[PDB]
């Protein structure tokens, strides 16, 4: 024989049998890059000399999380006893390493329990947040400045961010900002006082006795949001004599008529920075830029170089307002903005003017801005063959526009669609990262000439694992409704027939700016029931999803619940009647947003769907947070919204689950999706006599992520559509 | 036809009951609302079905004042825990048949009662006691010290409610409405469950529920009584409450009031229980005339302990006093470890058994001059029938029983409600016939009438294929141990059928009944033919302490061996189909399902657990400790680790499992299913869950009940090849 004979099964999903390489790297200069034991890898010629061997912290007596060099690598930080909070907060412990002296500084170490660090862009001058206060060292052997003296445990946050800033604005923990040189430090301060707590039950380990009640600050949609106030200090005129002296910046007048958000910073120069301030109405914002005042030692922003960006169609940005990318001399910038055909492309702004140019154009859209040096700028599109889920970089001439070159569509066409790269810290050199269709390939080259240097990584390995096991394939394709393109993706059962008819699985996202159908290659859940159970598992990008143009983003606009729920509905329809599906078996499946549309579809009574899964889903709008929430429905008030509000709940659609199999699972410690929006559900469900399938995760949050509970989900959820599909 | 699913959950076939409340010594009232006579039968009507048309609340209860005079009505009803509740309250002037509009009992009351004569009214708000002698009138305020979750006068905390009283109140007034006398409990300490409310789809943000409730080994609440003369209240100066202290022997560690009982006018008996529950004692305490103090002589302290358990069934028995209240009654474990009728001297450390015998006295019901009336299990050695005695009290050895024989095929199960002097009483036939009620004279001991037959009933069963039961006994060790099994019709001893076991197996259970039932199991039985079975093993009740105290300090031992060894059994009659047994169970039964499930003996295919206990720190103080003792390394912490579901999560491997859970459960914490369902994620091993959001222990909701019936037959169907 020597046919392939085995599939890609549960266990090998479960137990990562078949694991994708990466190579993360961290560019150090404009030439050298960190990789992990700790070489500097020399990116011109190839040669590596060691920077940290393996041993270095075995006597330590502590596990290392985590580490960070210093800039000028004199020092080294490292992070232990790191205890998890949200999406990207946590605690930690800290030891700095001199790296010269060959030994742990002992005196006025970073204390226990630090919320955030971060060395300064340039040296090795240190800033952190303890107990919600901001700390500064000099040199990392004194005593730290302290910044701030207003922190207060789940009501004034210093140089971090509250839960829902986090979650939805910054993406991040940290609000502390370095100016390019360290000279400047500036900082967001969030105030919760008025904002209302969730509060949920946390079990913890058997040996508690009493449960834990877990309490935070979040504001749910139309709820008191938290209060943002922005500053900066000099570092350099820090004093052991006298408290720090931070100066505020206010937002601008239309901001401070209501409520807003701080929705972006970004310095310019050593003496510029850049602030985008937001209504809580998230559909006018405005850039204030920032210089910094000698003789006063103050900042102002100037009133002519304010810049507005707006939307009639719906919110600004695709989650948030786009981040400029400043010129040299900080007199210009560029950023991504919607055209006045809906499509987002790069516009070039004069510091000192309202009218911006347009540099890219066309029916695709502009993902990001990667790097701008003197005479190129650096961007990521999908421009390439109108394939919207693809990805690739392009390099456009400043002095003439016409002149763009795509630096990744053609070194391997067939088995790379999807690209991100990393530049060095002036763009002299760059990774890229392939993600797909084919396996992960990870390249090195130098922009000068364009001229790929080395492979770092092409996955020979689990290449050569797969040559045996009967894989899946993709389709990415698209269906004209109403006159317009929508792209979906099936994974096909290997030795796929067209005569057959397959059972479906549609895995849903469908929120805003989502994109579920793309190029890239995954070793999933989807993969295990496509390749060992012969199950089609396919996704659509119906209206609202992102990515091409604000008619399909924006039509969903004040009105979630609707098309995007509708258009998954009606994608089953097209499978269906493309001829190898049977439509006696159609299930659908989602997480988060997912959850929801899953729920809003199999309460819908269309009666295309014969069971589904909902994780960890929104179940009605007044429950999830401001920020996501407002960005897209308003406010839930009888003078704006609050009609389509009570309009698009699950619990309403409760009746129509008679029709269908129903799987319902929550975490009972998620932070993000409440436990109480499952709970709604259930309690809706079981007064209209209602039978379904349910389950909680102790003690789990939003991603259900320990590895225990990880494997039990997906190994109760193969149950449950091995049993809807009657697959033995 | 059979009897289905429908049927149960919508109470298509319903038992008719014969509800009645005695007025004087042979006058009594039944729903309209009738003044039955217990000579003719006639009633004249005492309040038209629609006297309060035009009263504009929902009425949800009534109470007559033991004078006649005044009505108590009683609405706007909220639901606390068990037995506690809050309502306003209206009352009624029966004589002007108009209602009382100047001084009305406030909105939210949590206790009220009338005096045992006259019209006097006591009644608790926020946590303090007030008195009314005249309806219309200004009530006096007894205590100032009330206050939420902290400070309770006259009515229960959590723990005393749900495990010691059964009862919201704690007041007791005396035999003539002198005197009220009161508990006050302190819950200043006791630590808080806390758990999420979610209440209707409106509510933005949950709710956080905090109640102090004490689990096992933690603080518990303290206990304080008093006595208050009703006759010499003041609306000038505060009223005086005379405090009882607790004995000498109690006060030296943490204790319990566990009884409070009036021998007389002016003698008041309580029973006070260590928390190590197996030494109580019983002071009777007397007023003094010329001081207006309550004395509780040393000498008339009577201490009942326990060498090989706990004391009393779930706490010490009540005391009957003799009229003159030097003399009363009380059921104790004899030496034998049997469970008989004492009498005791008030002035005497000795008492006399006036019963004996291998069988056991489950209630003292009425104490005359010449007779003590009681029910028991003695008739045919069954523990599981009930029957009412008459004991001569010149002569113990004259022993009549009343109901043996009034009905012997049908009538099995007897409770019964004496008149005010015992000179009527109201037999309650509860099996294994359809209930039947009746009316007798005590006097001669004759039937006067039929009350209730369920004729009606008994018509419409005619037409549906209803399940039998079986009540018999197996030999283990030398020893009886009961079991019943609900068969389903045309029973076929040569057929091998599915068997369910159904169980509950706490201390002083008892699932093997002469009881008739309409519930789950006859679906099961009638239109699945599924054999559901019951198994009293050890720590069962009403078999004497050898049986009861076998669990002593060792729960999740021998009553979780003995139902495994029950299905070995069931087995081993022929008509069990091996490969189909499952077990299941509510609270103590489903603990027990779980450690069943978990033992990995291989008997049972499947399980479901609603609600149950996982590990004994997390339940309360009071009914953990009686039998588990303290967690502590100088206790019993050892065997607390031993006994946890969590234990043995590796186990269910080699089951399929249902695991349910109400969300607002303040009795068994859903933390309880929470770390079980833990430990299965933590093994990998799959199960089946149900959440129920904002159910308590009950899941008693008309839609929930329906839900989890309707979800668990589903489960059972499934796990037995039943389409
Ligand atoms: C199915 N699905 C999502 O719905 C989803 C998502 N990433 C996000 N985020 C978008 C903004 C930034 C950050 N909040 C993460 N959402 C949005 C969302 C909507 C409703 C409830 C919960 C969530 C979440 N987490 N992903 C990856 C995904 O698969
Ligand atoms: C299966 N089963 C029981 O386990 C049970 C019960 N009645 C009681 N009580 C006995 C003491 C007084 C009062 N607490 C009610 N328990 C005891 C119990 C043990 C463990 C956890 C919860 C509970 C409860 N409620 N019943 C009727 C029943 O069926
Ligand atoms: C955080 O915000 C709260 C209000 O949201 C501020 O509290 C107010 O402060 C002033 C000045 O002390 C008081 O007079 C007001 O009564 C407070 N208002 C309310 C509604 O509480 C608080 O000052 C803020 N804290 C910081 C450090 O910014
Ligand atoms: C209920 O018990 C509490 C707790 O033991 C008592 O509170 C104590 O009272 C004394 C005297 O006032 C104080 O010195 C203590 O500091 C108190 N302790 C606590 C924890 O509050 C309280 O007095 C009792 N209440 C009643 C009505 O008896
Ligand atoms: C009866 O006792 C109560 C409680 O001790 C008295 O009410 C308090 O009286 C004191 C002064 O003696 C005040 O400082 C408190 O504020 C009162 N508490 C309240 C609001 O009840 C009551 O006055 C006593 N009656 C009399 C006059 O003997
Ligand atoms: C790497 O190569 C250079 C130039 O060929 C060589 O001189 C040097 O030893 C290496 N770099 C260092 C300093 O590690
Ligand atoms: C952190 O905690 C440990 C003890 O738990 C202690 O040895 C150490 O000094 C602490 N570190 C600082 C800087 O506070
Ligand atoms: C700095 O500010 C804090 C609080 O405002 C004050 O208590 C502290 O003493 C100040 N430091 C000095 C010495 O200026
Ligand atoms: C950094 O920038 C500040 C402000 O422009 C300037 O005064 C300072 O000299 C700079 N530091 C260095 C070392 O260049
Ligand atoms: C029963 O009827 C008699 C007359 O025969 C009457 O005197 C008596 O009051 C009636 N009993 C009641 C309480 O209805
Ligand atoms: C009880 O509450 C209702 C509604 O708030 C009120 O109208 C009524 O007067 C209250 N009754 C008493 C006795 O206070
Ligand atoms: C009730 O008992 C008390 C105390 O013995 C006594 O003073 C009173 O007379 C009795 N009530 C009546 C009038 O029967
Ligand atoms: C009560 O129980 C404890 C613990 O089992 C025991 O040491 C003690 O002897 C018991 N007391 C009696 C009265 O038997």
């Not at 009218?355 to 859209?365: L, P, Q, R």
């Not at 499978?575 to 959850?595: E, H, L, P, Q, T």
Request: net charge negative; aromatic share 14%; proline share 4%.
């Amino acid at each position: 024989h020597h046919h392939s004979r085995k599939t890609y099964t549960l266990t090998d999903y479960l137990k990562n049998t078949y694991r994708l390489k990466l190579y993360s790297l961290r560019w150090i200069s404009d030439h050298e890059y960190l990789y992990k034991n700790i070489l500097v890898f020399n990116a011109e010629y190839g040669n590596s000399s060691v920077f940290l061997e393996n041993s270095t912290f075995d006597e330590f007596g502590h596990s290392i999380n985590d580490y960070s060099i210093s800039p000028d690598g004199q020092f080294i930080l490292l992070e232990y006893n790191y205890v998890k909070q949200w999406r990207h907060s946590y605690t930690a412990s800290y030891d700095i390493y001199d790296l010269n002296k060959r030994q742990l500084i002992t005196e006025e170490r970073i204390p226990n329990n630090t919320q955030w660090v971060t060395w300064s862009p340039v040296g090795h001058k240190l800033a952190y947040v303890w107990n919600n206060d901001i700390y500064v060292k000099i040199e990392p052997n004194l005593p730290s400045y302290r910044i701030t003296w207003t922190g207060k445990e789940d009501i004034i946050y210093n140089g971090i961010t509250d839960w829902v800033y986090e979650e939805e604005v910054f993406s991040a923990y940290s609000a502390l900002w370095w100016s390019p040189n360290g000279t400047f430090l500036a900082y967001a301060q969030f105030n919760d006082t008025e904002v209302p707590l969730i509060e949920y039950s946390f079990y913890s380990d058997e040996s508690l006795q009493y449960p834990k009640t877990v309490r935070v600050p979040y504001p749910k949609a139309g709820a008191v949001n938290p209060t943002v106030k922005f500053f900066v200090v000099n570092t350099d005129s820090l004093s052991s004599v006298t408290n720090a002296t931070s100066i505020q910046i206010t937002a601008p007048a239309s901001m401070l008529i209501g409520d807003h958000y701080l929705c972006d910073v970004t310095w310019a120069t050593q003496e510029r920075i850049s602030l985008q301030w937001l209504r809580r109405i998230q559909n006018y914002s405005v850039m204030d830029i920032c210089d910094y005042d000698e003789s006063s030692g103050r900042w102002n922003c100037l009133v002519a170089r304010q810049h507005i960006e707006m939307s009639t169609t719906g919110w600004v940005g695709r989650f948030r307002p786009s981040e400029p990318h400043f010129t040299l001399d900080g007199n210009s910038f560029y950023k991504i903005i919607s055209n006045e055909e809906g499509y987002r492309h790069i516009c070039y702004f004069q510091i000192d003017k309202k009218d911006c140019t347009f540099i890219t154009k066309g029916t695709w859209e502009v993902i990001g801005i990667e790097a701008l040096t003197s005479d190129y700028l650096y961007y990521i599109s999908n421009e390439y063959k109108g394939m919207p889920g693809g990805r690739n970089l392009y390099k456009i001439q400043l002095s003439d526009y016409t002149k763009v070159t795509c630096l990744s569509c053609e070194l391997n066409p067939e088995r790379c669609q999807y690209y991100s790269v990393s530049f060095s810290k002036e763009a002299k050199y760059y990774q890229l990262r392939c993600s797909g269709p084919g396996l992960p390939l990870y390249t090195l080259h130098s922009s000068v000439n364009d001229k790929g240097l080395r492979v770092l990584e092409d996955n020979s390995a689990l290449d050569k694992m797969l040559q045996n096991v009967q894989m899946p394939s993709k389709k990415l394709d698209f269906i004209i409704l109403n006159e317009t393109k929508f792209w979906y993706q099936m994974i096909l059962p290997p030795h796929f027939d067209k005569s057959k008819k397959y059972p479906l699985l549609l895995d849903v996202y469908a929120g805003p700016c989502s994109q579920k159908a793309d190029t890239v290659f995954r070793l999933n859940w989807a993969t295990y029931l496509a390749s060992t159970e012969n199950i089609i598992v396919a996704s659509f990008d119906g209206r609202g999803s992102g990515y091409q143009g604000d008619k399909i983003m924006h039509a969903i606009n004040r009105r979630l619940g609707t098309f995007e729920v509708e258009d998954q509905i009606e994608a089953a329809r097209q499978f269906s009647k493309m001829g190898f599906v049977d439509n006696k078996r159609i299930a659908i499946w989602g997480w988060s947003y997912g959850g929801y549309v899953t729920s809003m579809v199999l309460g819908s009574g269309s009666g295309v769907f014969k069971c589904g899964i909902a994780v960890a889903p929104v179940s009605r709008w007044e429950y999830y947070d401001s920020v996501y929430t407002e960005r897209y429905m308003g406010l839930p008030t009888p003078e704006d919204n609050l009609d389509h509000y009570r309009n698009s709940t699950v619990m309403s659609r409760a009746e129509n689950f008679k029709q269908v199999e129903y799987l319902l699972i929550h975490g009972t410690a998620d932070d993000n999706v409440h436990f109480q929006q499952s709970a709604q559900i259930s309690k809706a469900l079981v007064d209209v006599g209602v039978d379904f399938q349910a389950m909680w995760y102790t003690d789990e949050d939003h991603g259900i992520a320990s590895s225990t509970a990880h494997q039990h989900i997906y190994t109760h959820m193969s149950h449950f559509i091995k049993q809807c599909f009657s697959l033995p």
